[PDB]
Design a protein around this ligand. Structure first.
Ligand SMILES: OC[C@H]1CN(c2ccc(Cl)cc2)NN1
Ligand SMILES: [Cl-]
Ligand SMILES: [Cl-]
Ligand SMILES: [Cl-]
Ligand SMILES: [Cl-]
Ligand SMILES: [Mn+2]
Length: 340
């Protein structure tokens, strides 16, 4: 029956159940003070579902010019129509094919571009911003959002939100690649899964999704959300505490060296955004450096709260539309300060 919250990651991750509850801050704020990520479920039930479909984006914006990335090999597909991405989002037989004749796993780069989301999509902007959880933290004008209140001694976030659109990774070989590589942000962020597309053609690809979640180190309760309630899983995240960022840099310098990269001893493999931690590298981080992370499956309507300074990576299971907003909480403002 209905409850305020539950725990994932064996007690280490807060899951809030009611996204608009005026009392959520009472449960949120101690987990957030400790540097933990937080999950909030149910945001899809608050949104106008017609605004967030792949077919509407194609119909309304399809003649815009964009670049795509081939997630398998990082090859850039320059200066194509955005309809060429959207029309293959769920229908595999419409997808652009690589030279080997296979349908590609594509990411749409920087769309809408820079800060243009609000100008290009005013009705979507209103629908998202009015339904974000923890609104004193996440709204542009929230009382606990310092973004508009800080001097130039602090790195300030760009005007958001930002959309993140990409197909699902499909094969056993795809398990070792990221949709978004390991990186960190100096602001806090909330990332909302507004649509999950489960394809058709080569549709029935449900067994390799279970193997990816299992190999991804997902907890036993997370595995129950599929088997028992038939929720749509979108993406597998790994998030690490901000305090563990330098130990992760030491691991990736050592692995770069082993693989014959020629790197100065101070170079920053996290800022480079060139690594995805696969099962092998995650085990090595735990065993050799004593660092544990949070493995998080983001279902349709889940909002993931990512603490400033926390290294994180994203692997899409199915085709995803995500929308994210940056904010600056008082708990984590040290991470954007420009001195010492
Ligand atoms: O029927 C029992 C109630 C419990 N509930 C709820 C209470 C507090 C928060 Cl913060 C969120 C949800 N709604 N149902
Ligand atoms: Cl709009
Ligand atoms: Cl709040
Ligand atoms: Cl990336
Ligand atoms: Cl911190
Ligand atoms: Mn990020």
């Amino acid at each position: 029956s209905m409850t305020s919250h539950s725990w994932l990651c064996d007690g280490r991750l807060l899951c809030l159940h009611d996204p608009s509850n005026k009392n959520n801050w009472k449960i949120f704020r101690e987990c957030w003070k400790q540097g933990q990520p937080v999950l909030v479920s149910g945001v899809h039930k608050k949104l106008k579902s017609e605004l967030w479909k792949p077919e509407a984006f194609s119909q309304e914006f399809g003649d815009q010019d964009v670049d795509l990335v081939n997630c398998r090999n990082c090859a850039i597909i320059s200066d194509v129509k955005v309809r060429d991405f959207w029309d293959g989002f769920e229908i595999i037989c419409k997808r652009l094919r690589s030279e080997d004749g296979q349908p590609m796993v594509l990411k749409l780069k920087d769309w809408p571009p820079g800060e243009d989301f609000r100008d290009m999509m005013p009705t979507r902007f209103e629908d998202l911003m009015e339904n974000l959880p923890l609104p004193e933290y996440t709204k542009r004008d929230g009382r606990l959002n310092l973004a508009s209140r800080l001097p130039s001694y602090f790195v300030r976030p760009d005007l958001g939100p930002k959309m993140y659109n990409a197909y699902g990774l499909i094969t056993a070989e795809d398990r070792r690649v990221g949709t978004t590589n390991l990186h960190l942000d100096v602001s806090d962020a909330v990332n909302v899964m507004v649509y999950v597309g489960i394809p058709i053609g080569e549709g029935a690809h449900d067994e390799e999704v279970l193997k990816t979640i299992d190999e991804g180190d997902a907890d036993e309760v997370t595995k129950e959300r599929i088997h028992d309630h038939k929720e749509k899983p979108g993406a597998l995240w790994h998030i690490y505490a901000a305090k563990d960022a330098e130990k992760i840099r030491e691991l990736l310098r050592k692995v770069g060296e082993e693989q014959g990269q020629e790197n100065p001893p101070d170079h920053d493999p996290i800022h480079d955004q060139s690594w995805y931690l696969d099962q092998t590298l995650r085990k090595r981080l735990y065993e050799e450096y004593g660092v544990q992370g949070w493995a998080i499956v983001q279902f349709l309507g889940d909002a993931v709260f990512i603490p400033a300074g926390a290294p994180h990576q994203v692997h899409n299971l199915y085709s995803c539309i995500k929308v994210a907003e940056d904010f600056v909480s008082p708990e984590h403002v040290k991470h954007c300060f420009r001195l010492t």
